[PDB]
């Protein structure tokens, strides 16, 4: 299978509105175009851009519909050596 992998070092560089990546559950999402659409606003996303936002994403209690949106932004998996517990 042709899965794309990213190191966290790479993901961390995509930390502004120019190109915004985020890790949730060991996957990388490019949410650049979603910033202006996110119901929770842009700032909560930018504050964790380039980082692992799993804990915040889960703590907010996002709906099943919100979760299903992730397929629009998925760009690859975190490299296995860089996965969080
Ligand atoms: C790709 C990532 C994300 C997607 C697709 C997403 C999607 C959504 C959606 C659909 C809503 C509307 C409410 C719902 O359906 O549950 C929402 C609201 C909200 N989101 Fe997100 N979200 C993402 C990431 C985040 C993150 C990382 C945070 C916090 C750091 C956050 C904070 C909030 C807040 C505060 C609201 C409104 C208040 C609430 O729903 O309790 N979101 N988001």
From Swiss-Prot:
Q: Where in the cell is it found?
A: Mitochondrion outer membrane
Tell me a Gene Ontology molecular-function term this record carries: metal ion binding
For heme, which residues are the binding ones?
Answer: 38, 62
Keywords for this protein: Acetylation, Electron transport, Heme, Iron, Membrane, Metal-binding, Mitochondrion, Mitochondrion outer membrane, Phosphoprotein, Transmembrane, Transmembrane helix, Transport
Identify residues that carry N6-acetyllysine.
Answer: 13
What are the residue boundaries of the Cytochrome b5 heme-binding domain, all occurrences included? 3-79
Assign the protein's first listed, main location to one coarse class. mitochondrion
Q: Name one GO biological process term.
A: nitric oxide biosynthetic process
As recorded in UniProt, coiled-coil segments are none
UniProt modified residues of type Phosphoserine: 63
GO annotation, cellular component aspect: intracellular membrane-bounded organelle; mitochondrial outer membrane; nitric-oxide synthase complex
What interactions and quaternary structure are annotated? Component of a complex composed of cytochrome b5, NADH-cytochrome b5 reductase (CYB5R3) and MTARC2.
According to its UniProt entry, the function of this protein is described as: Cytochrome b5 is a membrane-bound hemoprotein functioning as an electron carrier for several membrane-bound oxygenases.
Return the similarity comment: Belongs to the cytochrome b5 family.
Provide the protein name.
Answer: Cytochrome b5 type B
According to its UniProt entry, this protein's organism is Rattus norvegicus (Rat)
* Protein's gene: Cyb5b
Shown portion of the whole protein? 18 to 102 of 146
């Amino acid at each position: 299978p042709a899965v794309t992998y990213y190191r966290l070092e790479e993901v961390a560089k995509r930390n502004t509105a120019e190109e915004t990546w985020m890790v949730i559950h060991g996957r990388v999402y490019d949410i650049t175009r979603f910033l202006s659409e996110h119901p929770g606003g842009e700032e909560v996303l930018l504050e964790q851009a380039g980082a692992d936002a799993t804990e915040s994403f889960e703590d907010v209690g996002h709906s099943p519909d919100a979760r299903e949106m992730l397929k629009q932004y998925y760009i690859g998996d975190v490299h296995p050596n860089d996965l969080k517990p």
